[PDB]
Amino acid sequence: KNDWQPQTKLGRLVKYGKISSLDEIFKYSIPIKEPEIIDHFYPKNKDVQAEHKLMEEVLQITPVQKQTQAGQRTRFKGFVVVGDSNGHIGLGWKVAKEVQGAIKGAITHAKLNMVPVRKGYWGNKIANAHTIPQKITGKSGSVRIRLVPAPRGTGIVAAPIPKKVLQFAGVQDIYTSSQGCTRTRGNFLKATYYALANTYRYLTPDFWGKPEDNELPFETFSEFLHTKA
Amino acid sequence: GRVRTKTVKRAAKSLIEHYYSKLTNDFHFNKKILSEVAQVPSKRLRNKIAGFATHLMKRIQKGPVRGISLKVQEEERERRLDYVPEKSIIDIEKVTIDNETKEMLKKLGYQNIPGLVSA
RNA sequence: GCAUUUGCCAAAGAUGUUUUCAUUAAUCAAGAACGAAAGUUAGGGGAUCAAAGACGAUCAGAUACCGUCGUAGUCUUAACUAUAAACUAUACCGACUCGGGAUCGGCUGGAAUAAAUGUCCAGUCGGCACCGUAUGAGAAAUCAAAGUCUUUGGGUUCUGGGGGAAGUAUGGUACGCAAGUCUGAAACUUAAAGGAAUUGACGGAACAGCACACCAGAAGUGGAACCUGCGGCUUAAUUUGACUCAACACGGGGAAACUCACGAGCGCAAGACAGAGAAGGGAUUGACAGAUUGAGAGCUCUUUCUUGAUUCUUUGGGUGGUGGUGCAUGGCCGUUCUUAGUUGGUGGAGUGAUUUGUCUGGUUAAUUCCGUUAACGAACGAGACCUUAACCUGCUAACUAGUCUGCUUGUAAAUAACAGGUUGUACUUCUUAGAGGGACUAUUGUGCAAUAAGCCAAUGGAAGUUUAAGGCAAUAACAGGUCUGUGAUGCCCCUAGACGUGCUCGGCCGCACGCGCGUUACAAUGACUGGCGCAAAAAGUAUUUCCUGUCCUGGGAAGGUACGGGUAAUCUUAUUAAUACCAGUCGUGUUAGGGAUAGUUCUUUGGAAUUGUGGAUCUUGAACGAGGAAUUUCUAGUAAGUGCAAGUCAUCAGCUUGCGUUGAUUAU
RNA sequence: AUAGCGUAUAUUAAAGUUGUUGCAGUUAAAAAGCUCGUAGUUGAACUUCUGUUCAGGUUCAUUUCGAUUCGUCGUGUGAAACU
Ligand SMILES: [Mg+2]
Ligand SMILES: [Mg+2]
Ligand SMILES: [Mg+2]
Ligand SMILES: [Mg+2]
Ligand SMILES: [Mg+2]
Ligand SMILES: [Mg+2]
Ligand SMILES: [Mg+2]
Ligand SMILES: [Mg+2]
Ligand SMILES: [Mg+2]
Ligand SMILES: [Mg+2]
Ligand SMILES: [Mg+2]
Ligand SMILES: [Mg+2]
Ligand SMILES: [Mg+2]
Ligand SMILES: [Mg+2]
Ligand SMILES: [Mg+2]
Ligand SMILES: [Mg+2]
Ligand SMILES: [Mg+2]
Ligand SMILES: [Mg+2]
Ligand SMILES: [Mg+2]
Ligand SMILES: [Mg+2]
Ligand SMILES: [Mg+2]
Ligand SMILES: [Mg+2]
Ligand SMILES: [Mg+2]
Ligand SMILES: [Mg+2]
Ligand SMILES: [Mg+2]
Ligand SMILES: [Mg+2]
Ligand SMILES: [Mg+2]
Ligand SMILES: [Mg+2]
């Protein structure tokens, strides 16, 4: 059973090669619950040179304890980052009693959590947006992270963890600032992620004009969906 | 201790669900019906299922039953429930308005629409 | 901090202003006014309580909680003192960000009446709050501020910078009569101390389940003799494991030898395999006979004759070990517990550990179901499953079951009755036991259930307590038990007068006592003497050995071996049990109740019975007159009584595991 | 790491753990028991707004164009904030 049968309307729309690009899903803000939709846009034919290669990384694995009916019952938590270096990043975490299990479930989670980082210009606008449009802030638990845009080739100035996240996002050049208890790795990761996410939340002056008015994919593709397969 | 279990009630639901047109108030009929219709590994089991399903036939004869949705019988029951007289209650040409309703109609200006009787 | 009436004195907010002034304001080192209680000084006052104190009680000790007293205090004038968890632990002035009723004080309209210092309604200003809610905040608890904070700046005082040291030392032309207040260190030492919240565990908190836990009862143990385990105590040795359920008639643990580990005294090697030496001109084995010994153990000693590498001496080293270690371990097994519990996926909630699911409530033996439902569906466990028991005058058949039919035989007047023997293209009620039925809580119920799960009753039914009684037993544990069940083992120990393998005699059974299972009784619902065609379930011969049927002998337990059957639905046997019943004796007293303990005889199993293996006959006849504090198990063919088998086993049941017979009281 | 490399001590970043930028003070250390108040710090709104015309650049845009060239220049025209 290596063939994917979509349980989501969006899932159908994706598998059958109807919705064009991933970012489009992001645009119409269609919830992705199915961790297939994502592997779709990232083909496993394995051409080594694409920067659109989708990357997975285990970050954390934690032995979590419970006190239950006189026993001490351990599970594992894990954190996972997924990203193509080009614009797209997700973070996920899962608890399970078997390690490789926690890992798989967390990969799946992270995929469901995919988010569109926005890339801006520091100084004069020439070629590759190497950084963020504004300064922004992640907040998780106690922790805070501030992302400030840096000039060309500054590189990522940031702790090992948020650095890893940012590299997955494909921010080349950045300045970091962190508050809170940062050694809480899940909160640090979370913060960096949410921060990276807020890039598109910020209304910058270039976003000021009237947007395009389009119909949702579902309204256009309504005919397709109501055929019975 | 005669409380009946999960397996049995799921079973009975299913058996009625698909077969209601075939089923009788008689246990001895329904048990044979079940036997033909299904794979039941035990005599005892089948009989428990048949008994409960019979019980539920009787409960269905009386009215609506939670957990079982017989769409055919429910649509028949729905057509049953409609009865319409020719006059309705709703008379467009004669309608009665409170004092306060009248005040709001004054506000909109509709106080004088044809066929409006104040009370 | 302020709560009785009235009068007086000055003061205050809010509201109401088409009044006046016109920045006069905000906050605040100096400096000042207050400031609970307790305490201090000088007078008063003194009823209540009441530090100190005096006593009672409690307690191991109480200089405490409790009780009887009682001083200072408590109250009051003048004065000091300045401190509290002086608490919203939350600085003041100012903006701005949600919703909703209500409340206290003004005012503004409106409405009703019994027409007012009263009601109601709608506004609004100011107070004290509350209830929702935040796509605001926070580590959270929580917060309409604790919001408008890395998108960080409205104004202003104060305070903090890990924990202790320590509010200590010291200095105060700072205070105080004093107590003390205010100011206030460092050395030194230390990795944590600390905050919220989660899950457990626990509670001398609240609530709710369930179980013979208790309730209504019964049989009783605990009291007695004896039996059999533990512990003590003797012992050469009294082998040993196992101590609350979850050790202690448990280790199949009923031991005369054996078993067997303990004890005393003796014998063997089954010390392989390798290296060195020795050996064929001899390694080594054996053994008459005399001593010797418990012993025809050639064990030893004298005595030589055999025997012919099966190897001997060392040096290494393996076999073997009921020797240690269950806290090195496997396996198995107890126990929580047969209780009803335990998970995960996808959705919901938390930054998170985690949570919901898995629940208020009914209902069930059951997280069994119904229903509630941010949860939806599922898995394990329970159920189902499986075994035994209960129903079939219907099926399939039976000489290794029975019935009938027809013949006969005996006793009899016998197509009577009761018994045998035969019989058949016979038959299935009884008996085997295969197939298939059957029960599902069925039918009914203006019975209780919020009409849902379910419970209840009556009827039918072989069967309606989950039909009954069982087997199986999740997740997790408990360093539970087991090296002594294992040729499952790690590690440790013993290795030739061995902790190896044998033989002989003891020992585990030894008795002032303590503690457990139990058998038997204390009698009249009884004991004893007769009579009486009532069971079930188990077993059974490697041929004489195993069940045993006739028969004979003996007064008896038991012996013959005379005739026989059975490896068994055929034979023991479809019997042989005992309570029970019917007669008769005995007559409420240590009586024949009760028989412990003893002495002769006889028999049986075993080489061996002494330290009585069991059984038989005469004697002998104890405690015990219904059991203190305590406490066990148990709801129907059930308890209780009553015998029978099987395991053990040559012999030995007061034990165990089962089997029926007679059959309850009381709950449900 | 490397002809260098350990160690001790003061000091710098790490430290938004001294904080003007920039911290905390309901419960983690932290709002003074409470008012008055001088120094100090802090302070409501109003006054030549505005419009019209000229020029100079400086920027901007580009359906104005041009010239040449590897990009500046000239020019439009309007559009700005200026001066
Ligand atoms: Mg930091
Ligand atoms: Mg005085
Ligand atoms: Mg005393
Ligand atoms: Mg007194
Ligand atoms: Mg009025
Ligand atoms: Mg804060
Ligand atoms: Mg939040
Ligand atoms: Mg609130
Ligand atoms: Mg600030
Ligand atoms: Mg013994
Ligand atoms: Mg060995
Ligand atoms: Mg031995
Ligand atoms: Mg889950
Ligand atoms: Mg989840
Ligand atoms: Mg979440
Ligand atoms: Mg729970
Ligand atoms: Mg319940
Ligand atoms: Mg469910
Ligand atoms: Mg059962
Ligand atoms: Mg132990
Ligand atoms: Mg004989
Ligand atoms: Mg017999
Ligand atoms: Mg004798
Ligand atoms: Mg005797
Ligand atoms: Mg025997
Ligand atoms: Mg025994
Ligand atoms: Mg504290
Ligand atoms: Mg000004």
CSV table of N, CA, C and O (backbone and C1' of nucleotides) in Angstrom, one decimal, chain D residues 58-81:
chain,number,residue,atom,x,y,z
D,58,U,P,21.5,69.7,-10.2
D,58,U,O5',20.6,69.1,-9.0
D,58,U,C5',21.0,69.1,-7.7
D,58,U,C4',20.0,68.5,-6.8
D,58,U,C3',19.6,67.1,-7.2
D,58,U,O3',20.5,66.1,-6.8
D,58,U,C1',17.7,68.4,-6.6
D,59,U,P,20.4,64.6,-7.5
D,59,U,O5',19.2,63.9,-6.7
D,59,U,C5',18.3,63.1,-7.4
D,59,U,C4',16.9,63.1,-6.8
D,59,U,C3',15.9,62.2,-7.4
D,59,U,O3',16.0,60.8,-7.1
D,59,U,C1',14.9,64.3,-7.1
D,60,C,P,16.1,59.8,-8.3
D,60,C,O5',14.6,59.6,-8.7
D,60,C,C5',13.5,59.4,-7.8
D,60,C,C4',12.2,59.6,-8.3
D,60,C,C3',11.9,58.9,-9.7
D,60,C,O3',11.7,57.5,-9.6
D,60,C,C1',10.9,61.1,-9.6
D,61,A,P,12.2,56.5,-10.8
D,61,A,O5',10.9,56.3,-11.6
D,61,A,C5',9.6,56.2,-11.0
D,61,A,C4',8.5,56.8,-11.9
D,61,A,C3',8.6,56.5,-13.4
D,61,A,O3',8.1,55.3,-13.7
D,61,A,C1',8.3,58.9,-13.1
D,62,U,P,9.0,54.2,-14.4
D,62,U,O5',8.5,54.2,-15.9
D,62,U,C5',7.2,54.3,-16.3
D,62,U,C4',6.9,55.4,-17.3
D,62,U,C3',7.6,55.2,-18.6
D,62,U,O3',6.9,54.3,-19.5
D,62,U,C1',7.9,57.4,-17.9
D,63,U,P,7.7,53.4,-20.6
D,63,U,O5',6.9,53.7,-21.9
D,63,U,C5',5.5,53.8,-21.9
D,63,U,C4',5.0,54.4,-23.2
D,63,U,C3',5.2,55.9,-23.4
D,63,U,O3',6.5,56.2,-23.8
D,63,U,C1',3.0,55.2,-24.1
D,64,U,P,7.4,57.0,-22.7
D,64,U,O5',7.6,58.5,-23.4
D,64,U,C5',6.5,59.1,-24.0
D,64,U,C4',6.9,60.1,-25.0
D,64,U,C3',8.0,59.6,-25.9
D,64,U,O3',7.5,58.8,-27.0
D,64,U,C1',8.7,61.7,-25.1
D,65,C,P,8.3,57.6,-27.6
D,65,C,O5',9.9,57.9,-27.3
D,65,C,C5',10.8,58.1,-28.3
D,65,C,C4',11.2,59.6,-28.4
D,65,C,C3',12.6,59.8,-29.0
D,65,C,O3',12.6,59.7,-30.4
D,65,C,C1',12.3,61.1,-27.0
D,66,G,P,13.3,58.4,-31.0
D,66,G,O5',14.5,58.1,-30.0
D,66,G,C5',15.8,58.2,-30.4
D,66,G,C4',16.3,59.6,-30.5
D,66,G,C3',17.9,59.7,-30.4
D,66,G,O3',18.5,59.4,-31.6
D,66,G,C1',16.9,61.1,-28.8
D,67,A,P,19.2,58.0,-31.8
D,67,A,O5',20.8,58.4,-31.8
D,67,A,C5',21.2,59.6,-32.4
D,67,A,C4',22.3,60.3,-31.6
D,67,A,C3',23.5,59.4,-31.2
D,67,A,O3',24.4,59.2,-32.2
D,67,A,C1',22.7,60.6,-29.3
D,68,U,P,24.4,57.8,-33.1
D,68,U,O5',25.9,57.4,-33.2
D,68,U,C5',26.5,56.5,-32.3
D,68,U,C4',27.0,57.2,-31.0
D,68,U,C3',27.7,56.2,-30.0
D,68,U,O3',29.1,56.1,-30.3
D,68,U,C1',26.0,57.4,-28.9
D,69,U,P,29.9,54.8,-29.8
D,69,U,O5',29.8,54.9,-28.2
D,69,U,C5',30.4,53.9,-27.3
D,69,U,C4',29.6,53.7,-26.1
D,69,U,C3',29.7,52.4,-25.4
D,69,U,O3',30.7,52.4,-24.4
D,69,U,C1',27.5,52.7,-25.9
D,70,C,P,31.8,51.3,-24.2
D,70,C,O5',32.0,51.3,-22.6
D,70,C,C5',31.5,50.3,-21.7
D,70,C,C4',30.0,50.1,-21.8
D,70,C,C3',29.4,49.3,-20.7
D,70,C,O3',29.1,50.1,-19.5
D,70,C,C1',28.7,48.5,-22.8
D,71,G,P,28.7,49.3,-18.2
D,71,G,O5',28.2,50.4,-17.2
D,71,G,C5',26.9,51.0,-17.3
D,71,G,C4',26.9,52.3,-18.1
D,71,G,C3',26.2,53.5,-17.5
D,71,G,O3',26.9,54.1,-16.5
D,71,G,C1',25.8,53.3,-19.9
D,72,U,P,26.2,54.8,-15.2
D,72,U,O5',26.7,56.3,-15.3
D,72,U,C5',25.9,57.4,-15.6
D,72,U,C4',26.4,58.2,-16.8
D,72,U,C3',25.6,59.4,-17.2
D,72,U,O3',25.9,60.5,-16.4
D,72,U,C1',26.1,58.1,-19.1
D,73,C,P,24.9,61.7,-16.2
D,73,C,O5',24.7,62.4,-17.6
D,73,C,C5',25.8,63.1,-18.2
D,73,C,C4',25.6,63.5,-19.6
D,73,C,C3',24.3,64.2,-20.0
D,73,C,O3',24.2,65.5,-19.5
D,73,C,C1',24.6,62.5,-21.5
D,74,G,P,22.8,66.1,-18.9
D,74,G,O5',22.2,67.0,-20.1
D,74,G,C5',23.1,67.5,-21.1
D,74,G,C4',22.3,67.5,-22.4
D,74,G,C3',20.8,67.7,-22.4
D,74,G,O3',20.4,69.0,-22.2
D,74,G,C1',21.3,65.8,-23.7
D,75,U,P,19.3,69.3,-21.0
D,75,U,O5',18.0,69.2,-21.9
D,75,U,C5',17.9,69.5,-23.2
D,75,U,C4',16.9,68.7,-23.9
D,75,U,C3',15.5,68.8,-23.3
D,75,U,O3',14.8,70.0,-23.4
D,75,U,C1',15.9,66.6,-24.0
D,76,G,P,14.3,70.8,-22.1
D,76,G,O5',12.8,70.3,-22.0
D,76,G,C5',12.5,69.0,-21.7
D,76,G,C4',11.5,68.4,-22.7
D,76,G,C3',10.1,68.3,-22.2
D,76,G,O3',9.4,69.5,-22.4
D,76,G,C1',10.8,66.2,-23.1
D,77,U,P,9.2,70.5,-21.2
D,77,U,O5',7.6,70.6,-21.1
D,77,U,C5',6.8,70.0,-22.0
D,77,U,C4',6.0,68.8,-21.4
D,77,U,C3',5.8,68.9,-19.9
D,77,U,O3',4.8,69.9,-19.5
D,77,U,C1',6.4,66.7,-20.4
D,78,G,P,5.1,70.9,-18.4
D,78,G,O5',4.5,70.2,-17.1
D,78,G,C5',3.1,69.9,-17.0
D,78,G,C4',2.9,68.5,-16.5
D,78,G,C3',3.1,68.2,-15.0
D,78,G,O3',2.0,68.6,-14.2
D,78,G,C1',4.4,66.6,-16.2
D,79,A,P,2.2,69.2,-12.8
D,79,A,O5',2.8,68.0,-11.9
D,79,A,C5',2.1,66.8,-11.8
D,79,A,C4',2.9,65.9,-10.8
D,79,A,C3',3.4,66.7,-9.6
D,79,A,O3',2.5,66.8,-8.6
D,79,A,C1',5.2,65.3,-10.6
D,80,A,P,2.7,68.0,-7.5
D,80,A,O5',3.6,67.3,-6.4
D,80,A,C5',4.5,68.1,-5.7
D,80,A,C4',5.5,67.2,-4.9
D,80,A,C3',6.7,67.9,-4.4
D,80,A,O3',6.6,68.8,-3.3
D,80,A,C1',7.4,66.1,-5.6
D,81,A,P,5.4,68.7,-2.2
D,81,A,O5',6.2,68.9,-0.8
D,81,A,C5',6.9,67.7,-0.2
D,81,A,C4',8.4,68.0,0.0
D,81,A,C3',8.8,69.4,0.2
D,81,A,O3',8.4,70.1,1.3
D,81,A,C1',10.3,68.4,-1.2
